[PDB]
Amino acid sequence: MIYEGKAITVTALESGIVELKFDLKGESVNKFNRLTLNELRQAVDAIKADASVKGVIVSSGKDVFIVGADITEFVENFKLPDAELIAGNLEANKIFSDFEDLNVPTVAAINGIALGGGLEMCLAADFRVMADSAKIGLPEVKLGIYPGFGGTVRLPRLIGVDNAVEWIASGKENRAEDALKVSAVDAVVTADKLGAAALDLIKRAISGELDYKAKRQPKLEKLKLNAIEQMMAFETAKGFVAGQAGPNYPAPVEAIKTIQKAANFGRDKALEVEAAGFAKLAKTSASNCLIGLFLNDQELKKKAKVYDKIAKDVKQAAVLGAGIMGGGIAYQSASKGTPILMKDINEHGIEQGLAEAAKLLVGRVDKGRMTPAKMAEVLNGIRPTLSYGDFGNVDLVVEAVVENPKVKQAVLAEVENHVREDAILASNTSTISISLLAKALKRPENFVGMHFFNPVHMMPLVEVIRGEKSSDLAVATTVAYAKKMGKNPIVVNDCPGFLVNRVLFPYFGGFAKLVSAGVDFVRIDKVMEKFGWPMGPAYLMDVVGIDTGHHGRDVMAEGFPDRMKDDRRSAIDALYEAKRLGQKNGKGFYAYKLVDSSVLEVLKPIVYEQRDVTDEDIINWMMIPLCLETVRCLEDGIVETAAEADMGLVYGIGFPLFRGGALRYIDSIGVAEFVALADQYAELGALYHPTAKLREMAKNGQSFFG
């Protein structure tokens, strides 16, 4: 044959047409690893050199076309200089660019999944045929990076700015129907007639019927948008995403900046822009370990998967209590294909739940994001009830009853007598011990903790609080059930405050100290947002609520009095005692986001010193207390590995992604140089006191990772 590699076999066909096939021999899927990209080069060079070729068809010998790229091999290539990195992806793009420059028609017969680099290969060809049962997209954003193989160059010019920005920024998969309408694909057919379509199409390009040259042009030249049409398009996109992405902007807000700049450029120059910005999101030391993300991700994605083939099926679920949290758990479980029952005691409750679940569904339909037929399915999935008559086939049950140890125990023990004995029970409590609630039940092995965060549909993280008598199967099912609901679960052992919350308040402890030191909270969060945090300390406190934060303070103070039991009134007590209950009340550190000098009056009694501080120190008063507590959560055995200890912060509290995590941030400074930094702030309390184990591994030149 023309080329017989281990991943790509370029086989010849009729009328000089050649079929470049992707079939990673040995593996189950096709992906652009070092080997694949290498053979592609040899493949293209072969076809290119062969002057007898009259067309090229791209296919796959697997169930999927080409899944994302297995990035573990590309990691060592991102820690080099931005020059030796940009020119690095530049060379990689030379392959696809050349394939796109083949003086012959090229079609991509997409049989199945074509995500990430898989789609980028397709965008390179002239035509693209797709099986109605396939999916395509660019989920790069979930990794903190945007398309690096011409994705930000070809898609925008192929389907249009707005459509590309949406496809890229969101990283959502797209069905044949949608991929065809936006013109990402040129023809959708049944799986059986895929090969015939690609073949019949190529022949129509060769004969001259179809101008394959004219169809390729659009992604070689500038965008068709006006200078004015650009400003509108880009600014709206940027803004829209800027407020929904916050200070820590991975691929969303940057992807648009790259398209806006490479707008008036052709392929070659556009690729350079893509490469440059791509490096800014992947580079090294300057506090930008977007490296640790994958070091944590490639360990959770594997650890979770192992849990996923163990967990029981969650074909039937149910939640105790409607309204706020209940309506969310029901919504999420319904929108992900899991029939859930909304159990409650009064009809007024079910009304609240059904209402909120309906307000969210209509919210998407009243804009175009959700199909009316889909809203129907979701609503049918949610099934109201004031009894336990239908709890006969429920696999996993979640509790959302009012915050009360006694009540929760009665309710939990109650449901345990109306479901199968092999059924899993879980509480959504946040300030009550899971090991305490389990005592009421007669089957603690099936009882665990499933902690969601308000709003249930907004926040990603879901803590799986394992009790002392919780079985592995129990945790496995809960973890899996969380992932199925499009979440990111993390196993955490039972303790006052768990992992996220227990670490989120010490962080706020540093804030409370700043305000008491005459530091303007407005300047504070502006600095914390400049750091990478989604929301600022003061602004976040308003969202959570001053009345809530005040209650949580006592919960953590009682938990670990030795270091989290302050007491000298702070901004928290000030606003609480001043009726400024936060965002829900309409007045907190801000007004509802507005500013007003009236808040200064309330905070005056808290100012104990007009201490001066740089924005650099402000970051320490906050981060140090948060990092150290994480070290304690790892030492006390609240989280098993450092990997889990940081992602719990990345998805929960919203720890800056490109900075890795609390523990990785420590490494970014140096464990030995971190304790030295902490000592200077030791005069602030036990919150800034390094642990014995940290001091021990400080002298040994030991770091949390390697």
Binding site: I159, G160, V161, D162, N163, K181, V182, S183, K224, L225, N226, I228, E229, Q230, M231, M232, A233, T236, G239, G243, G368
Partner: protein, 390 residues
Amino acid sequence: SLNPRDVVIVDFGRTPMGRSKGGMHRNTRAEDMSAHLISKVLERNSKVDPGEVEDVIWGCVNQTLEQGWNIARMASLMTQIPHTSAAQTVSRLCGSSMSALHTAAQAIMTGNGDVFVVGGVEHMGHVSMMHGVDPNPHMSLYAAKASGMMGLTAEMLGKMHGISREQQDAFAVRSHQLAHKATVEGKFKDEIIPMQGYDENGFLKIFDYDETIRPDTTLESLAALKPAFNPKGGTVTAGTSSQITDGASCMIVMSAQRAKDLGLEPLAVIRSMAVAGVDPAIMGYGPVPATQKALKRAGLNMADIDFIELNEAFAAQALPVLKDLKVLDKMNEKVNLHGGAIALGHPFGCSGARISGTLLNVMKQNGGTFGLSTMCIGLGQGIATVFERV
């Protein structure tokens, strides 16, 4: 003297501009509203035989439901107008009604008819704007989708020319105040045709004013509203934007020849017509290009125009248009002396002839000679007309 085929506007009559959110027209179809208007207007002019109307050119945008299937004929059939006449609906989004005036004008000039009945209608209450919209994804391949959102364009055009929140709100106040004034003083009595409607209690009664007008509109009351198209740093508020209004406007047009024969004194005479295009992103800038083209064809300088009627889409767009037209310092002296779409509402398929009609009343009332009526159009367009009082 005039030439035989010179276009002459004989009369102008509009309906009371009522709110859409449960206004006075909440129980009246657009077809009937138009049919009634055309019928009543033809009455005041008993010397123009309805049978002579060669064609009825009606403007309308969202042509579906009540407004679908050539509403021009649908509304014409319920009029004293014979079945022997013709009718067509002209859509150009905002400038629909005006384009109608132009079509008939050119027809008359070319000897394809002598008497016409132009105008437009838009019942945004029964047929809202967002109703039945299917955004073509392919449009994003040649132009920004955001340009489809009139509001955002107002924001962009505004940023460019630099118009402060106060500058816009102040404009809205001037519009409401002047509208109320003209109303109270009866400067609208001639153009407004009394029409049946229902008050907030479902009771039947005739309205002869514009519900849309809000005299209490103060800089203080407008500075309380929040940005409508851009919460995080915006100036265009519902107060400085045109109102969603249900309403129709009519206008009898014919040649000076057939006019001189009927011995009826003209209301005005069309001297030049012009339409131009701009980028969708800043469509609000449509008036300047369209105006400049009209002035050249009319062989006139912007200074030769005594009165100006610039349909107020947004204070953010009207002001810039007036600045570049070099007449901002002449506003209170000759620009929308009876208020604008901000206080009188803006019925898409209607505003075209309405602003022009009101333009004539201003000239006639203030001894003006040359007048100008222009307006910006969606998706980047503009249109202008230069009338003349003789």
